[PDB]
Amino acid sequence: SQANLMRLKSDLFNRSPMYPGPTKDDPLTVTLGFTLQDIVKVDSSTNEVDLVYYEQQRWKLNSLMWDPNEYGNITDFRTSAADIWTPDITAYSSTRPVQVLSPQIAVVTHDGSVMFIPAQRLSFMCDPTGVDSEEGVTCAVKFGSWVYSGFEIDLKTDTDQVDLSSYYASSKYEILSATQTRQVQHYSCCPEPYIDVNLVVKFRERR
Amino acid sequence: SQANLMRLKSDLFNRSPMYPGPTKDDPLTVTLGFTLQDIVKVDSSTNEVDLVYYEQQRWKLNSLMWDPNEYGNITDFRTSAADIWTPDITAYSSTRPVQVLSPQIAVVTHDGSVMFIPAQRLSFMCDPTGVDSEEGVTCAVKFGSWVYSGFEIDLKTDTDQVDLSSYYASSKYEILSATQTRQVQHYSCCPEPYIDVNLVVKFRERR
């Protein structure tokens, strides 16, 4: 049993060159999803807001496919996220380096599908003026590829509703709305689109 | 004598590929235990509390067994934690990357048991409202594998009572109760269980 897995990981990683990133010929679709845990700091003196969340990333590579029947009917395995290529999805308006709060371990399926969910703490630009009121305040931060256009990495969500079921029950803040929306952007110069997922969270201090 | 140990380490590590983690076929039981040292910070403005503790981890691999009579009657040895596979146990509600306060050295015994106790400082979600009162306040944080279900990593404790014998005698806080309880979670969608150990501490400022 363990023999199959040791053999499988060897054939995928050592037997092959590493996936060189997508192109226009061999594009790649990445599905993104957020699970907010808590808004842990709000700084009105700098307009900086801190989130703790789970970032779900799922993509599919053909170079990661294998036949379960050739490897002891193994359909999936777990491996360090450093061992594999990962997409360059970034919050465009972060103000400090994202802090990783979880292990960075990816799970590969025999169809070449990969799911990767690092827990992270993010500080980003947001004027919280109005948080201490009934109306609240809205913050927004876009996530997207840093160097890949829409012709090379397709971004999309499974739902527009942010997962709020694990938000800390006794947090200092109440979530009024939280959405994750796929957006397409074109520029007059250029035919290729540029895609982002707009994370929009409306919240207020809780009384 | 000392030559034997180098040979033992050779046969276990450089002979075999790295243990690739458990599988549903070959599950693994991990024993969890905490020895709480101190509650070192309470931030009521952000609902963030800092603990300093020892996290005792024990598991058993068949691939690390050896015959004591075959290696100069050596029954145990110490080795760096990077050298061996270690479980991805994580506090689910941490707010900052865990800080390690100790060397990361594991001790392996001839029956395949490994025990590993990193000292750590953890910031996690807790509303401390009530800490300066007679009733005190309770904080809780769940620990479990990040990517392995219960069918792959079995979580177990040796006692439901957290070790408080090393709690700082002159701490700013008094421990009212400290328990470590195994919890199993099932989902309507899915047959496999998901296990966590709930560390629940009730405490108050010292009067």
């Binding site: 779900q56 799922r58 499974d158 997962d163 | 496999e192």
Partner: peptide
């Protein structure tokens, strides 16, 4: 509720 649990999400990518 599975789709909120990190380990649960990955073993069921068809649901989450």
């Amino acid at each position: 509720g599975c789709c909120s649990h990190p380990a649960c999400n990955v073993d069921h990518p068809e649901i989450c």
